[PDB]
Design a protein around this ligand. Structure first.
Ligand SMILES: Nc1ncnc2c1ncn2[C@@H]1O[C@H](COP(=O)(O)O)[C@@H](OP(=O)(O)O)[C@H]1O
Ligand SMILES: CCN(CC)CCNc1ccc(CO)c2sc3ccccc3c(=O)c12
Length: 257
């Protein structure tokens, strides 16, 4: 196809929860658009200084009104500022703001990444939210310290998930609670977003439906990304602990990071 000059603004809002292929999707959008896509990894590796800013936004987000009041404009401006220079959003903490992002970026299209709820839960427990008594939790915390992630990071991740599920009293150790929130969250996205503006991507769907939805060619000779498996994250955590730095090992994780 012909090459056209794309605007550096949010063009794709992905409402999918972590462990549904968000990092692969982030990489896929960057291959298409040649500009950055937001993700929790963007905070971890490039934008740790914005942790407090995401926290402040969540703190004020209860004051959002779905016309537009004056308090919502202030919140919307901080969201737009946080995303300046990016062409898409995926993952926490952005995903729970999908409805507000649709208002801020009226010409952006919306994606929902989904998968089997039990596969999701098991992936979540291995990587990002182990049960409190799971010994692997202590390894995650040790690797996090190597990356410079402290208590404010843990607050932001939890608070952003509570915001996405619209539930402050969240028993993170309760599998049935989490599964119920996952199903209700995905149902609400599909009920909320007009179907002309939504594409639901199940894990493994690949380039095709995404590229058709976005009116772009499939990137020639590039396989759709497959990164961030729970096995690969376990290796990343163990390698961070072993070497005590990211830069000692980053060349071993060329696409994940
Ligand atoms: N192209 C692809 N095909 C199949 N699964 C994929 C994929 N890209 C990512 N995944 C899976 O999506 C999960 C990562 O999601 P996220 O990046 O949102 O955390 C991992 O699940 P598992 O932990 O079950 O392996 C990973 O294996
Ligand atoms: C050594 C491993 N370290 C660094 C890589 C894990 C860093 N942690 C996270 C990474 C990515 C994501 C979402 O992509 C989440 S989401 C979430 C949601 C609720 C609670 C915690 C988390 C969470 O801790 C996390």
């Amino acid at each position: 196809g012909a090459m056209i000059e794309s605007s550096t603004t949010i063009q794709v809002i992905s409402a999918g929860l972590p462990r549904t292929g968000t990092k692969s999707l982030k990489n896929a959008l960057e291959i298409i658009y040649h500009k950055p896509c937001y993700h929790m990894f963007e905070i971890i590796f490039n934008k740790q200084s914005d942790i407090i800013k995401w926290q402040n936004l969540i703190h004020d987000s209860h004051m959002i009104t779905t016309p537009l009041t004056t308090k919502t404009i202030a919140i919307y401006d901080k969201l737009k500022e946080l995303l300046d220079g990016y062409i898409a959003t995926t993952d926490l903490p952005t995903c729970g703001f999908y409805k507000d992002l649709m208002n801020i970026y009226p010409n952006a299209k919306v994606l929902l990444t989904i998968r089997d709820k039990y596969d999701w839960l098991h992936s979540l427990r291995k990587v990002v939210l182990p049960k409190s008594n799971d010994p692997w939790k202590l390894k995650i915390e040790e690797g996090d310290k190597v990356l410079g992630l402290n208590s404010d990071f843990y607050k932001l991740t939890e608070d952003s998930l509570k915001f996405a599920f619209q539930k402050d009293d969240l028993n993170f150790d309760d599998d049935q609670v989490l599964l119920e929130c996952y199903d209700e969250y995905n149902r609400l996205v599909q009920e909320t977003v007009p179907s002309d503006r939504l594409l639901v991507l199940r894990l493994g769907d690949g380039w095709e439906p995404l590229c058709k939805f976005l009116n772009v060619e499939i990137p020639n000779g590039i396989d759709y990304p497959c990164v961030n498996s729970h096995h690969q994250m376990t290796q990343l955590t163990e390698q961070l602990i072993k070497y005590k730095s990211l830069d000692a090992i980053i060349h071993m994780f060329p696409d994940l990071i």
